[PDB]
Nucleic acid binder design. Structure first.
Ligand SMILES: Nc1nc2c(ncn2[C@@H]2O[C@H](COP(=O)(O)O[C@H]3[C@@H](O)[C@H](n4cnc5c(=O)[nH]c(N)nc54)O[C@@H]3COP(=O)(O)OP(=O)(O)OP(=O)(O)O)[C@@H](O)[C@H]2O)c(=O)[nH]1
Ligand SMILES: O=P([O-])(O)O
Length: 1095
DNA sequence: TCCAAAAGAAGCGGAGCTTCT
């Protein structure tokens, strides 16, 4: 252990003594880090990192010599070198700001003088950077090596951080803001998704800094310093970037939104470089110069990504061997640029792509304020995708003379729910714009005869891309629907694209031509279809047409169907047989396809089935209050308002209700996964208000074109036949808004009662500022909840089955109870350790625990089985990083601001997370994993979780393999996996040890409401063990069901489009039987199997 | 209670209580 000597030799002049027991100032940098056995950073040992790296960046020859490589990325040319020269000079400016900020900190309140006199200011939350200073006469100065290396990290972060951030949705913004998700003001989500929170910015910066410093953390040093020092440095660099205007800080006052929200929340936005900045073409020169093993880079040719050892953001969970094999397979796939699409995008240009695929130029006064904010977010996503694609294209273009010949590989990792995620925001898996420009799919096709199988494959790809629902009709019928479209409405766009694929020119009205031809079929993949068909038309050799056009083998109501197959536990029922067939499990129908099912047997998918059940439940609710005119009227008004604005709700002239599957799509999915009804009500209301705000811009558009337009024709002219007819749609609108905001349903003793809000809407509508908000939004939500969402939930349960609902409830309860215990025991062992440390004279409050101490606490929980194992996947439901364990500031900047909480990897309560973790994981996650690793695994695909893009040459075999992979996943038993973990947990848990908080948390899950109050430890223990029994019985039923199903003749077409179903070749023939007959025979086999078990 | 990543700021003082034009 000559590690102390080693690091002291590199940093001999840092203030203090590297001995935790020494009496004076102790140096916590040298106490916290060691030199690595093998070099990680080329700046370790450098007297002047900025000068050294700037010299390295100054020429190709110098770069190659610094990095010890033969050749540099060809994108690193003269123009890029000139930009890095200028960036390096800016690095000097950042360094200078930092030095001045230190000087100010040392001067203020005599901190420097006191520090020199022995005040341990280096251990304060704002003084941890004093661990990297050196005595300088009557003052102190930064160690230049550590300062300059940190600045290099700062520069790289500045270049590429924005592109690397997570996407914020409504739930994220709700957690951040503390505002109820259903009540988030319009445009707030966009505001927060465009910026980084303090924790987001500092943590990403701190990671980079620690990486570039290139040392290893001492396992026996307190986290207050190992995490604290790089975090303190990050905070200072963020502050310096704010001074330099590289970063804008915006402190958002929540009280202007919710007046009793006291939170003021910092948002940090990096100043964007010009889209045409040469540095965009190679933004990682610093990273690839400093680090021996760079993270940030593109992988060209045979440069392939390494395989990740651990689950994304879950370092306690190693990727299994099967998972690692899947990752290797996906990373091995070669992606290539499709030049025609790149040229098309380029020729249209950014402005016209925004006009076509976004919202175009916004006239902020033909626009409702709320609608305007939604349109800004639409533009932002498309624009960022476009810019990112072209930066990537510029880098590819440097690699060779023919950009279409340059292989590209992408890094992937497994997420906590077992999905293979392509790393990055703007890649083929995540970004539709990019997905049509960079593809692994490729085929050489004989399209000389429109009767070829090759031409049929080509047609299928075109049709699917053009929004023909290819899984709902046979290949033959598809062909005719496509032909009708190509020769009809799409013809003008095809002609335009033929001209483009001849001369390279587009007409001035290109956007209008595409818009009018496509209508609601418009998408990036639709643009690919127009491109590829027109290319075929002009092709000189149609017998060898080369195209990346693909067919997606795409899951049919995938999550719900997987849940039903994986977690239904009872005897077989005929309703279940009928409903599961809607997802492509066919019993007694050899070689049956989804296409045939939809066309000849049942045109109603699982969404339509639940929508139909909603119509029944709604009808019953209307009957239970038949005599109640106020209630009937309130329901009518809700339905009227929805009919006005949503395509999926239609009221006929005689009051006949038609609901389309579209309204049940998200509600169905999220309900199984443990979503409450209130959140669904919120989302349905948001869909309505979105449409209202959109219609208000339609009004402003009408008025400007025609000053003497009536308010009725302005708002309902596109929807009506006469002027007075538009007047009745307007009368409906104002009547509906008044009654739905001034009156709400409340459930009192099971019966719905109407209550006045006192906060009804009325007054002249100002279409520009019109906003539904606060108490008015709450009211619309309460109406939606009781008169629509509740019936829908009843319909959903009827459709997926009460048995599945029971399984998911037991799953939720078991995993929640386990997570509560894990969280509480981890916290107690931490608190017990802190009580010991307080007796240690070397320890100070704010120093936390060491990594060794934390690992020992993590290891101590292992007899509680925190991990779920399936044999090929590992799930850690409780795994989190949170600020609650340490409950303290980690570091601040030198102005006593940017106070970053100390976050710790620790178990936290699951809530309902167990349901989606296991359903997604053992369903689509296992499917894809299997597809990547099975015998004859399809090559050259793009997997997107529950769909896989396949090149036209291999659509048949790849689809059949996909259906086989579904079948393989259907041999899983997630409840059994949960049971095995929970049973071990039950063997080792002591409920008497839990805090009354944890004990209450468990009570809610394990006990009926009337029993929470004050039940005993032994009560909740006995209730928790009953859940173990429930799990065991469910797991047993599932096992039997899968075994029995596998004995029978099955045709599986869940990954549908192509009509290539997987046959299980089970030997019991259930053909020419009704579902009732089939249920009887399956239940006979079940009881047979149950008897073999008992005997 | 849907999931795939968390996540107030800042004066005084040197942690953690306090207050929030
Ligand atoms: N908890 C949960 N799960 C959700 C969900 N929406 C969907 N899921 C899960 O995915 C399957 C299949 O859904 P699908 O729409 O066919 O395919 C999606 C999906 O796999 C994934 N995805 C989008 N949003 C979410 C999400 O909010 N959560 C999760 N876990 N997954 C999501 O991405 C696929 C779409 O990829 P693509 O870029 O091609 O986009 P599309 O062309 O489909 O159009 P777009 O609007 O962008 O999606 C479900 O059965 C379920 O298990 C949800 O809200 N919550
Ligand atoms: O066109 P699809 O949605 O049936 O694959």
């Amino acid at each position: 252990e000559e590690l102390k000597e080693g690091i002291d030799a590199v940093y001999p002049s840092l203030v203090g003594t590297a001995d935790s027991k020494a009496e004076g100032i102790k140096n916590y940098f040298k106490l916290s880090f060691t030199l690595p056995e093998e070099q990680k950073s080329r700046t370790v040992g450098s007297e002047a990192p900025l000068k050294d790296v700037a010299q390295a960046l100054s020429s190709r020859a110098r770069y190659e010599l610094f990095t010890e490589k033969e050749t540099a990325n060809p994108a690193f040319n003269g123009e890029v070198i000139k930009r890095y020269k200028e960036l390096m000079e800016h690095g000097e400016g950042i360094a200078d700001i930092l030095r001045s900020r230190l000087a100010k900190f040392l001067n203020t309140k005599d901190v420097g003088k006191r520090f020199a006199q022995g005040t341990e200011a280096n251990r304060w939350v704002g003084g941890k950077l004093l661990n990297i200073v050196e005595q300088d006469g009557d003052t102190f100065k930064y160690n230049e090596q550590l300062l300059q290396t940190a600045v290099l990290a700062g520069l790289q972060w500045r270049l590429t951080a924005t592109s690397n951030t997570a996407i914020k949705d409504a739930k994220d913004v709700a957690a951040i803001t503390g505002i109820d998700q259903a009540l988030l003001p319009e445009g707030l989500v966009e505001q927060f998704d465009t910026g980084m929170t303090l924790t987001e910015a500092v943590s990403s910066l701190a990671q980079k800094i620690e990486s570039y410093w290139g040392l290893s953390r001492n396992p026996n040093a307190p986290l207050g310093y190992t995490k604290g020092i790089p975090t303190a440095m990050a905070a200072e660099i963020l502050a310096a970037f704010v001074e330099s205007t590289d970063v804008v800080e915006n402190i958002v006052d929540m009280s202007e939104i919710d007046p009793d929200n006291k939170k003021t929340i910092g948002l940090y936005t990096i100043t964007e470089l010009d889209s045409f900045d040469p540095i965009n073409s190679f933004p990682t020169a610093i990273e690839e110069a400093v680090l021996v093993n760079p993270t940030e880079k593109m992988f060209f040719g045979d440069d392939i990504p390494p395989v990740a050892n651990t689950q994304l953001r879950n370092p306690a969970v190693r990727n299994t061997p099967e998972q690692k094999a899947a990752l290797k397979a996906e990373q091995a796939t070669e992606f290539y640029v499709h030049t025609p699409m790149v040229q098309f995008y380029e020729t249209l240009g950014k402005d016209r792509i925004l006009e076509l695929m976004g919202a175009g130029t916004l006239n902020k006064e033909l626009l409702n304020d709320n609608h305007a904010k939604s349109l800004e977010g639409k533009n932002r996503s498309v624009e960022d995708s476009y810019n990112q694609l072209f930066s990537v294209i510029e880098q590819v273009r440097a690699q060779s003379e023919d950009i279409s010949t340059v292989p590209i590989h992408y890094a992937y990792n497994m997420t906590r729910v077992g999905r293979m995620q392509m790393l990055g925001k703007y890649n083929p898996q995540s970004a539709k714009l990019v997905r049509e420009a960079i593809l692994p799919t490729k085929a050489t096709l004989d399209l000389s005869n429109q009767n070829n199988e090759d031409f049929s494959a080509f047609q299928l790809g075109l049709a699917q891309a053009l929004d023909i629902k290819v899984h709902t009709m046979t290949r033959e019928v598809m062909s005719d629907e496509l032909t009708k479209l190509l020769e009809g409405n799409l013809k003008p766009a095809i002609d335009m694209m033929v001209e483009f694929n001849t001369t390279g020119s587009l007409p001035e009205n290109a956007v209008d031509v595409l818009n009018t031809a496509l209508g609601d079929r418009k998408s990036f993949v639709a643009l690919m279809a127009l491109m590829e068909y027109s290319r075929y038309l002009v092709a000189e050799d149609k017998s060898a047409f080369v195209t990346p056009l693909y067919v997606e083998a795409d899951g049919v109501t995938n999550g719900p169907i997987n849940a039903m197959m994986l977690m239904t536990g009872g005897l077989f029922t005929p309703d279940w047989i009928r409903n599961i067939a809607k997802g492509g499990l066919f019993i007694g129908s050899p070689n049956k396809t989804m296409n045939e099912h939809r066309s000849t047997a049942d045109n109603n998918d699982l969404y339509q089935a639940s929508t139909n059940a909603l119509m029944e439940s709604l009808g019953k609710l209307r009957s239970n209050y038949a005599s109640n005119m106020p209630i009937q009227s309130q329901i009518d008004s809700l339905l009227s308002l929805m009919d006005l604005f949503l395509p999926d709700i239609n009221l006929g002239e005689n009051g006949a209700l038609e609901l389309k599957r579209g309204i049940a799509k998200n509600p169905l999915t999220i309900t199984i996964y443990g979503s409450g009804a209130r959140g669904i009500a919120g989302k349905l209301v948001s869909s309505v208000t979105d449409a209202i705000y959109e219609r208000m811009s339609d009004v402003l558009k009408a008025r400007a074109k025609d000053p003497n337009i009536s308010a009725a024709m302005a708002m309902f002219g596109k929807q009506a036949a006469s002027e007075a007819h538009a007047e009745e749609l307007l009368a409906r609108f104002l009547k509906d808004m008044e009654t739905l905001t001034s009156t709400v349903p409340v459930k009192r003793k099971g019966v719905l009662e109407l209550q006045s809000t006192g906060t009804g809407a009325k007054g002249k509508i100002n279409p520009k500022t019109y906003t539904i908000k606060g108490e008015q939004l709450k009211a619309l939500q309460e109406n939606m909840l009781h008169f629509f969402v509740e019936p829908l939930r009843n319909g959903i349960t009827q459709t997926v089955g009460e048995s599945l609902v029971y399984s998911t409830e037991q799953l939720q309860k078991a995993t929640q109870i386990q997570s509560v215990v894990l969280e509480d025991m981890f916290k107690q062992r931490v608190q017990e350790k802190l009580a010991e440390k307080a007796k240690d004279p070397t320890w100070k409050k704010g120093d936390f625990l060491t990594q060794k101490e934390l690992n020992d606490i993590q290891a101590s929980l292992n007899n509680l089985a925190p991990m779920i194992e399936t044999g090929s996947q590992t799930f850690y439901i409780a795994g989190s990083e949170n600020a609650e364990v340490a409950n303290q500031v980690l570091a601040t900047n030198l102005d006593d601001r940017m106070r970053v909480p100390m976050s710790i990897y620790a178990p936290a309560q699951a809530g309902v997370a167990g349901i989606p973790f296991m359903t997604i994981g053992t369903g689509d996650g296992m499917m894809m994993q299997t597809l990547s690793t099975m015998k004859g695994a399809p090559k050259n695909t793009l997997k997107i979780f529950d769909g896989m893009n396949i090149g036209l040459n291999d659509i048949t075999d790849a689809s059949r393999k996909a259906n086989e992979a579904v079948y393989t996943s259907w041999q899983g038993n997630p409840i059994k996996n949960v049971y095995e973990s929970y049973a071990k947990f039950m063997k080792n848990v002591d409920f008497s040890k839990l805090s009354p908080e944890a004990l209450e948390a468990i009570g809610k899950s394990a006990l009926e409401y009337d029993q929470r109050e004050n039940a005993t430890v032994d009560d909740i223990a006995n209730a928790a063990s009953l859940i173990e029994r429930n799990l065991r019985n469910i797991a047993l039923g599932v096992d039997i069901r899968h075994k029995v199903l596998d004995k029978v003749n099955l045709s599986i077409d869940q990954m549908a489009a192509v009509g290539a179903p997987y046959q299980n070749n089970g030997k019991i023939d259930l053909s020419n039987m009704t579902p009732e007959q089939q249920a009887d025979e399956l239940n006979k086999l079940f009881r047979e199997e149950l008897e073999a078990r008992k005997q």
